[PDB]
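Slack export, channel: ligand-projects

TW: morning all. Re-posting the request from yesterday since it got buried. We need the structure predicted with the small molecule present, not the apo form. The ligand is 0YN; the SMILES is in the block with the sequence. No rush, but it would help planning for next week.
GE: picking it up
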Amino acid sequence: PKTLTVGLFPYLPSWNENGNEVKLINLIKDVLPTQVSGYNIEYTEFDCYSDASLQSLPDVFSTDSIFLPYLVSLGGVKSLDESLVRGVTGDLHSFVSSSASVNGSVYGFPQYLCSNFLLSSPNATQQASSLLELAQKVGYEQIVYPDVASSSSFTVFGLYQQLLQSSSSAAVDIKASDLPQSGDQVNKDITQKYRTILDSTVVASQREYINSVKQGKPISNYYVGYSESMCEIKDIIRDQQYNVQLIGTSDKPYVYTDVLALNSNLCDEKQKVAVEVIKNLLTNTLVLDLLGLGLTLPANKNGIAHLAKSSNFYAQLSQQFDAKESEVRVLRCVDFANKEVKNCAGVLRPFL
Ligand SMILES: Cc1ncc(Cc2csc(CCO)c2C)c(N)n1
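GE: finished. pasting the full token output, ligand included:
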């Protein structure tokens, strides 16, 4: 009868000790209430990195803000009042709030924060402000960066646009015309800088790096990747005193944000229930504590502060987001999504 379909961001950490796989998204799911305000609540995994899923939105969904402006253009999302979101999330960083803003309007509740952070060892032989700077200072094959070494589509597409584009505001909104279509459109200067980072990257996966740290013999004192990817050594990061920081590939540091948005076809009775479910997701201390176990970052200052009270890891990031608040950029797409990203990455790859 009256059911609320909730689409969750499914790309959360996963623990594994051979055979048995524990997914953090399952832990969070088995904590959220299935009965709210008379409505039945269905939590399912919503893959925003699938064009098919972006074509059929649920009542409420968690999408990467990278597709948000394009998602707004389809009209499938509902505009929200500034006060309504503020009363749920609380204080938001400038880049976080701007990541949910499209055409001077808020289109969802910021849920997750992420970036390619730099995990520096205690024996950090070098310090840097950009990955280009760290590439020159340390040298050939010294930094661990799995997504760059493996040339992941979103990373190949991502870094290229970060090096190329520049903005005064936080939102770096690009169109489909700004994408290389062949090879004569590929900026060689940008591709030259990407190569320097790739040259400074060791040919090693994430699993190989983690196992090295666990065995006490790290393959490198430098690691770049998602905060969630470091969750299997969160104790070692704390004990041995590893360092984390917002580092840009060049100049400005980039950030991913996942945003809980409401469908445009929601009635007034469903809108209040959806907000209630959302307010639970963002403020429930048990949910936040579970996020802390997977080292994934809440988007609001309150969620970050809560986890910063018992984690030095979160403490550094909270200091980082505050110190470089005006410098952080967020890449977004105006009139394209996954297909055009995968295609653009395929064009760029040979020139790397
Ligand atoms: C919380 C969080 N962590 C990481 C990401 C970034 C990501 C995760 S999977 C994926 C697909 C790559 O092919 C990307 C870009 C995100 N959006 N939110």
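GE: first-pass observations. Residues 11, 49, 64, 112, 114, 152-154, 226, 228, 256, 258, 296 surround 0YN (CB under 6 Å). The chain is about 40% helix and 15% strand.
TW: perfect, thank you
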